[PDB]
Design a protein around this ligand. Structure first.
Ligand SMILES: O=C([O-])CC(=O)C(=O)O
Ligand SMILES: O=C([O-])CC(=O)C(=O)O
Ligand SMILES: [Co+2]
Ligand SMILES: [Co+2]
Lengths: 472, 472
């Protein structure tokens, strides 16, 4: 009489990702604001637990490609979806930028984000070092908003159910209002989803709120959602059907429909979901120039290498003739990752390990380390899940003259707001707001250009209706 | 302490659909034989329970568009995959044709199919009338092959778990070597999958072999596969990852990977699966002119109308100006189906009900019934799941002068082989084989043209490598 224990019948919450992660994963975050607003009213009345609509790569995209002010995008969504819990993805001490910042910047950014309407802050760190998440978290609590501590899921010799339960505890210990299990690479299998979700519930209590974010890259995560729901998961993330699958996510409608008769239910307005879906089915074709060309890829389960990392390393060897050695790089990546203490292979970690793998294949084993890689071995990105190869660490120290550190990298950073402020105020177009100063601090190289063109209004790099017909 | 009982740890069998249903669902059965053979050796060594590679719409496609002889395709697959159980889809008394045939034709077709290498015959009837399946089944047993009785899954007021358990019993009663639950529209939800699968096991025994065939049209069937496996399902059908999803099926690799740690396992050679996958990833782009443009559609759960039926009805109103009334037709379909005794909405049933719905919207309620629709109401397609509206039946009788029948439609059919033989032998190109006579009997209108051009060899209607680059 073999049996599985499942959570008591209950309503499961849904977080819609169409406005942020979905298009970031499917069309390089190129989705224009004018192609989104027409769906806000319906999304707002759909019945979602939260609506992910800011953060992640959208800040960069807004200013770099769309000549759009992120803060204006945030203000508009807040206005167009007044009844909803807006959600964002924030990479801890890196905020939405390229480097860790002094705490005062984190304070400023979070504060201005809450001030403009952000309700739920999913804070995460690419290395999974809770220290890098600690200040952002506190900042979110101070603004009286929902702080969601993030655990980046991954598979490696050092990652275990126990290790994740511990990390969860650390997150709760720093005031997490909830825990997000983030599986960007779709590495979370069904059984593991059930065990981890249950392990955390059994350990910290049923009251412990867990939100599961799984991409559908590998094709197995929708089954993992079911198992997570049986393990008692509180909220799962999805993407409206016309903007789903591939490197994207599981379909909202599908996740809602698959529960009928299980005892579990979602409570989303199906007719509203249908409008949201059609809205995007009409719009999506315009972005064909940015679609990925693969729907299902399970290779990562064996290679441990994500595609977005795979193609990139290829473009390096290809644009360097040694495109044949792609098999030697494939074998080198694991070794480099291990040397780095097995960090989750997500941006930036992924790029760093990828590029470094290429070097060891060509110029020889760590004969020359990038500055970024050296910074990882030396601790400037924080602590790794496992201890790093002391030998490779030493080399790094001998190739950069930098001294190893083991404490939160932000502890060494000096106040910078005043400096950033003065510098931003010298740029043509600057409007005086901290918002603008933050844009400059997060993107020194783009802020100037953006500030000068912003008055032109946001644009779109998607095909026009004209262009669509003119092709077909 | 809520709990679910799951089957004992065990190996689950997999049936690969890439060679038949996958391309029929994703690229209108246009897949050229030369684009397939290069994958046979690997598919043969993959470890699948069976390989669906013939039947369904491939016969028609081979002779109508590819100038290819189906029997030659069957002989080649048999040769290229000597170690595998080949499988086919056969629509009962209709064989792979357009009408029910006299038993002697069924005998001839099945016999020649086994003779040329077919091992597993999935026999099914669009109305789910076991009588229409009875003779084909027996014929398969006589050839000493595996007879798989099919239950076309659907949702309707008359379809219940009990109703399916009964149908299963009828299938076993006529010698079924196994039962196939076929969900062409991806209507099978997780709970129902578990209940039905278990209901049949609990009722006829664990020894009862059940094979589940779910399309991924609605996005919920991979979760249903898991539940079916927990309910004890023996074999599930999948499509190699590069030829999956959409109106197609769940990914083979994904289904294999999602089981890790559950106690269940598949035993497929992952490296072989990888070659099969790459083989088709390279080839698939050439068929872009035949792809569907939707990946996930849950609308059918509310409308009860499949897309392939939906678009067709639209092309009727569109090519007739009354494209506005598409909402009136949408409401009429349910009514017509009910009148017909709720048959599963799969070909031919779907087309018949669709077209008839259009008429009632225009010319008025059954003011004019098609001959096909009249035949359904009158019983010439067999028995319906539920009793048909006696009023609509009467009308049919008064608009066709045909008398209602309730017995197996084939009971009225006269011997025809001799007739078909003589007629086929008058065509230029005819080679004398029963195989050819069968081609003529199944496709009177095409056989002549095919026989005349066959010597040219099979062709492809897919883009060429040249054409691909010349576009991109
Ligand atoms: O999928 C995620 O949540 C991770 C993400 O977008 C990012 O790295 O910016
Ligand atoms: O999916 C199925 O098995 C049904 C099918 O192909 C057909 O109607 O020819
Ligand atoms: Co994501
Ligand atoms: Co099918």
């Amino acid at each position: 009489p073999r049996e599985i224990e499942v959570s008591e019948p209950r309503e499961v919450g849904i977080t819609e990702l169409v406005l942020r992660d979905a298009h970031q994963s499917l069309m390089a975050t190129r989705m224009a604001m004018e192609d989104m607003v027409g769906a806000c009213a319906d999304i707002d009345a759909a019945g979602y637990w939260s609506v992910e609509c800011w953060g992640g790569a959208t800040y960069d995209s807004c200013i770099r490609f769309l000549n759009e002010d992120p803060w204006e995008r945030l203000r508009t969504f807040r206005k167009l979806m007044p009844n909803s819990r807006l959600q964002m993805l924030l990479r801890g001490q890196n905020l939405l930028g390229y480097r860790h910042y002094n705490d005062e910047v984190v304070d400023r950014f979070v504060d201005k984000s809450a001030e403009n309407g952000m309700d739920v802050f999913r804070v995460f760190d690419a290395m999974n070092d809770p220290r890098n998440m600690a200040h952002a978290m506190a900042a979110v609590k101070k603004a009286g908003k929902h702080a969601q501590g993030t655990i980046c899921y991954t598979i490696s010799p050092v990652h275990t159910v126990e290790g994740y339960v511990k990390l969860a505890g650390q997150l709760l210990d720093m005031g997490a209002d909830s825990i997000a299990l983030k599986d960007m690479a779709a590495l979370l299998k069904p059984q593991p989803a059930y065990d981890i979700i249950k392990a955390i519930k059994d350990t910290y209590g049923q009251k412990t709120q867990i939100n599961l974010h799984c991409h559908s890259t590998t094709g197995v995560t929708e089954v993992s959602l079911m198992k997570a729901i049986e393990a008692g998961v509180d909220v799962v993330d999805t993407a409206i059907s016309s903007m789903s699958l591939g490197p994207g996510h599981n379909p909202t409608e599908s996740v809602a429909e698959m529960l009928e008769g299980t005892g579990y239910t979602t409570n989303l307005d199906y007719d509203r979901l249908h409008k949201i879906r059609d809205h995007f089915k009409a719009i999506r074709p315009k972005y064909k120039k940015f679609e990925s060309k693969t729907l299902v890829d399970t290779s990562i389960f064996k290679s441990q290498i994500p595609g977005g990392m795979l193609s990139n390393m290829e473009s390096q060897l290809r644009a360097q003739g040694a495109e044949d050695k792609m098999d030697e790089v494939m074998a080198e990546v694991p070794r480099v990752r291990k040397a780095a203490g097995f960090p989750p292979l997500v941006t930036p970690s992924s790029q760093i390990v990828g590029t470094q793998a290429v070097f060891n294949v060509m110029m020889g084993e760590y004969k020359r380390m990038t500055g970024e890689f050296a910074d990882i071995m030396l601790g400037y990105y924080g602590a790794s899940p496992a201890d790093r190869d002391p030998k490779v660490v030493k080399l790094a120290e001998e190739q950069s003259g930098k001294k190893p550190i083991t404490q939160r990298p932000a502890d060494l950073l000096p106040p910078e707001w005043e400096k950033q402020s003065k510098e931003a105020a010298t740029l043509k177009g600057f409007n005086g707001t901290d918002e603008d100063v933050l844009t400059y601090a997060l993107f020194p190289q783009v802020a100037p250009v953006f500030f000068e063109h912003r008055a032109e209004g946001p644009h779109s790099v998607a095909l026009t209706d004209a262009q669509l017909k003119a092709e077909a």
